[PDB]
Amino acid sequence: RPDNTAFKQQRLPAWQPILTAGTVLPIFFIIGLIFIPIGIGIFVTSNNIREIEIDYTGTEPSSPCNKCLSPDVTPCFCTINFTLEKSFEGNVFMYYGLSNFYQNHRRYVKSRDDSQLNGDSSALLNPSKECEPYRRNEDKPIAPCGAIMNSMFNDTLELFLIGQDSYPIPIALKKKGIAWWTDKNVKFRNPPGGDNLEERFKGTTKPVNWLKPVYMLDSDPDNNGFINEDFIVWMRTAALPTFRKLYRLIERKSDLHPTLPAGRYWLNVTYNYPVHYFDGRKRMILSTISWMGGKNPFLGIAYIAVGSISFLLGVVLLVINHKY
Amino acid sequence: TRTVFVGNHPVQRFCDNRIVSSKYTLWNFLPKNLFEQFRRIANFYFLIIFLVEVTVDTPTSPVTSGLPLFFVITVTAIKQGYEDWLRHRADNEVNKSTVYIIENAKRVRKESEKIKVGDVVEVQADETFPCDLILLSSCTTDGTCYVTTASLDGESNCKTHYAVRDTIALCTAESIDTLRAAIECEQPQPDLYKFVGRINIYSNSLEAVARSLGPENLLLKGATLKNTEKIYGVAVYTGMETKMALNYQGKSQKRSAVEKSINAFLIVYLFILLTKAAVCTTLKYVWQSTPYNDEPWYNQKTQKERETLKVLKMFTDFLSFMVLFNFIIPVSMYVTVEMQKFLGSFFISWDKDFYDEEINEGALVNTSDLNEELGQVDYVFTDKTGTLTKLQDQAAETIEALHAAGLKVWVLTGDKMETAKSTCYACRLFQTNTELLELTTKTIEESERKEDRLHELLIEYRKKLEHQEYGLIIDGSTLSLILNSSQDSSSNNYKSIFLQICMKCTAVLCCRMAPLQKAQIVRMVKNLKGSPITLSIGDGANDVSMILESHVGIGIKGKEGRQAARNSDYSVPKFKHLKKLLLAHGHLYYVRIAHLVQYFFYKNLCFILPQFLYQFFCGFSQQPLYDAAYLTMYNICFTSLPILAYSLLEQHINIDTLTSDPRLYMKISGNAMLQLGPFLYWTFLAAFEGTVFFFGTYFLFQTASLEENGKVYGNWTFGTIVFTVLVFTVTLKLALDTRFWTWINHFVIWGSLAFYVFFSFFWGGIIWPFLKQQRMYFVFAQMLSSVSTWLAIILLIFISLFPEILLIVLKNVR
Ligand SMILES: CCCCCCCC/C=C\CCCCCCCC(=O)O[C@H](COC(=O)CCCCCCC/C=C/CCCCCCCC)COP(=O)(O)OCC[N+](C)(C)C
Ligand SMILES: *[C@@H]1O[C@H](CO)[C@@H](O)[C@H](O)[C@H]1NC(C)=O
Ligand SMILES: [Mg+2]
């Protein structure tokens, strides 16, 4: 027939691979030979990383920061002494961790006006209905509407190094550059027009829990409102009940000295964020990084355990096929 | 009785001459199509879900569970409406035929559809009668005509019919006009051999002659006229009352064994869904029992949500979990199934192995709903006259291939017992060393002798056997004694005793069978000890009832007529084309769809299990793990094309090597690939992979940073890693099952992975002003700046595909 083409007659050219057991046995050896060395490389890298986490949520009678678990005068001030046995070599990063904090809760995640945080003129005055309980108060719309922005983490952590004398030398913490380039440079934008940020938020009001409006978060025009690094970092949800958020980074000194020399340090914290209502902890984490990121032995242990199981299975399936 | 006037003038309550081989008219198309579409449990479930989401107030618009349902329903309805429209056109070429009618002293030509009861029709030599005529006159003397009813009862001899003695000398289409008579005939009956009637010819002066009629005058519709230049008959029965059309048993809905396996799978996956939704709700309401677990001061409920009823909140939460996990029951699977059924049915029509030169046409596909059960046939019921017969080109070596494939061939004919047995010997169905167990009317000329030998040749002669040794011969009159008289003896029922012998002999021959008894045999076979898939292949109008009765009915485009090629599912213009139709086409058709339906459930279980495991680490708050842009696009964009192209043009065994070897047919016989064994393997593999994705991503997120610049990830980035691993694993899983790698498979398998990666680049990377969520602006583009995430994804892909590789190494050798 005139329609006796290859497609219509089911005779299209094909590859037809033969996946026999004699051509897959080398695959089990190749995979095991290239997974084990990778697993070792990710395993010593995870061990060379230095990381210290100190807990400061109080809840202990002999805890230095317990004295203001329910303080009478605010703001609270409390200091914690820790020591570094081994100096931190590269550029270290300051994190803060919160457990039992369900940021990945359906009623919490959807509680933002992403169009309003994008600098939209219309969404600024009349925010969305999803951020309902934290949407309007005093007849005025809340500028960072929603639970995510309303419950922003607002502790102040500072680090001091106890020198040869009693007086401490404060180490400099860098604020800018902790959030994603993309979600700070495009996704999070200020309202479009105006001379100063105090004028762009005319009809809006600050969140109830905040002490200062969004336009007074920082004295830096590039870090003032809706583009604040800390606000942007907090407004990215957590994916787990216990999480960590980047707080500051300590750039490596131009000298040969390590960024965090071994010694006794002070972590003196302005205890502003309460977490003991929902039985949540609160810690500060300093850590060095690598090509893979932070300290996690899961990848190193899994790659070795996978490349050694496949290798042994290949040996077994090779000795077995020696009978025939 | 009815009154018929010969010239259609006095000397209404009857229908019009028309053939209806189609199912739906314009009035009952929707009500009848809805019943067939809602026989599917997924459609019923998603109709119930849509109905509940409208009557009550929900946080879930009904549009999420109503648009897919409406799309599926009108996708599988356009196909049925178009397929039945071709059957409407098939009846047009026979209804709007050409017939000549002696209206008034003139040979006006009407259509075969415009014949009324009581008009003198004229039929020439070799012409089939348009309706049930009564022979009034023949041009020659003696008023005798010869009729061959080879399509009505399978007899090859010429039968002689007699005209009416009063009107034998009326010819030339002129004296017919001057004929006044009234026919008082019996209301139509399907016996095909008896007829009672009367003619009351009235002359100008006086004629009270009442010549009693009989079957020797009636000319049936569908029987050709031979060795007579022309005749002059008067229509009495005019379609849907013709004796040929009264033996049609009535159309029903045919559904293959794969469509019934989908309903059984949907029952298991409905229990998984209701278990997930119940386990999540029960654990949610014990988690929320802690005062600080709900309203923890950082997300607080509104007043409306606080004052709502707790008992209504339980129901709403259960239904919300059901909506969250509803993808476990795929409705996009029906759109793929019907599309691949419609596009795969063209391989039968396009085949050049089904082309007959002497009649100049190939195979026909009336219905594409039963492509997959051509590879599941267990019994073959073949006519003889016209179908098996000299013999046909390969009528004997086609039966050998059917026997090697494990099929059972029964011959159901309406011809003489001796002729039929000689034909069965000729086609090597009854070999020389085959002892015949004749149950015909020759030895059963009584009612009680039937018991004396039905039990004699089964208990004492058949249990005392080889399988091939014996062969049964049954008659149509004796089968009536077996069936009708079995309503009294229930201790030793004649039907069961007869059926025991039928299943123990190599071949069964049924002779002198009425068209409604060949359907009764298929009905008896269809009901015994399970679900034997039955096939019936015929060429005449007496095979139509058994074609509409079997699971799949094949028709032969023979010289007798096209009555069995219009009421069938497929029509090959030869008996030998059944070998390639079943062995080569049915095998691939079943193998493709059985793999597709298993893969569709595996695909969705791997998609939903990580989202169910997320609830234990969320606040049990039915928060989706993946983005709304991923949840909807997973089934229609990322994983829709690779399985469509596989199940359309994938050959696990080359099309030229399973036609040569017929013993590969029994490998898949008995719904082998849709059984509990394979179902459990696919479900357990899907559960293992779904657990691996989530718990390999969860242990990776204990780092506080996955990249070198020390930046943290959110919940959406947690969801995109799981989704990437899931998509790559379920796509590379099908690449391992592919044995026919065409350039189209290379384009839809590697083009689906290359499109998902770029869609991440594009969806994340362009700001749309009209959107109001903007929650995935650069999630993947910041995900790809970390080496440790790439290494984890590749590791989780190989771990999940490790059982498949192990089974390929173990089972697929020796
Ligand atoms: C879509 C755009 C982004 C959405 C924005 C985000 C918000 C959306 C929110 C609301 C819901 C939207 C739903 C609308 C759509 C539902 C339609 C529906 O139902 O028919 C869908 C389309 O049929 C199909 O299988 C597709 C047709 C058959 C297969 C052929 C594939 C055709 C497309 C291929 C393009 C791929 C090309 C590129 C890759 C390959 C390389 C070349 C199937 O249903 P489903 O499985 O998707 O539904 C399940 C969800 N259940 C249960 C709630 C209803
Ligand atoms: C560190 O915190 C303490 C807490 O009272 C407070 O005196 C001040 O903010 C800091 N002190 C020094 C010495 O850095
Ligand atoms: Mg026939």
Author numbering:
A (entry chain C): 27 to 350
B (entry chain A): 19 to 29, 38 to 415, 651 to 726, 743 to 1091
Provide the authors' own sentences about this structure as they appear in the paper.
Closely related P4-ATPases, ATP11A and ATP11C, act as major phospholipid flippases in the plasma membrane of mammalian cells, with strict substrate specificity for phosphatidylserine (PS) and phosphatidylethanolamine (PE), but not for phosphatidylcholine (PC), thereby contributing to the asymmetric distribution of PS and PE across bilayers. Most mammalian P4-ATPases, except ATP9A and ATP9B, require an accessory subunit, CDC50A, for their proper localization and functional expression in the plasma membrane. A previously reported disease-associated Q84E mutation in ATP11A confers the ability to flip PC, implicating the involvement of this conserved residue in substrate specificity.
We first determined the structure of the outward-open E2P state, at 2.88 Å resolution, stabilized by the phosphate analog BeF3- and exogenously added DOPC, to confirm whether the mutation itself perturbs the conformation or binding site structure. In the E2P state of the WT, PS forms only a few hydrogen bonds with the binding site, including an interaction between Asn352 in the unwound region of TM4 and the terminal carboxyl group of PS.
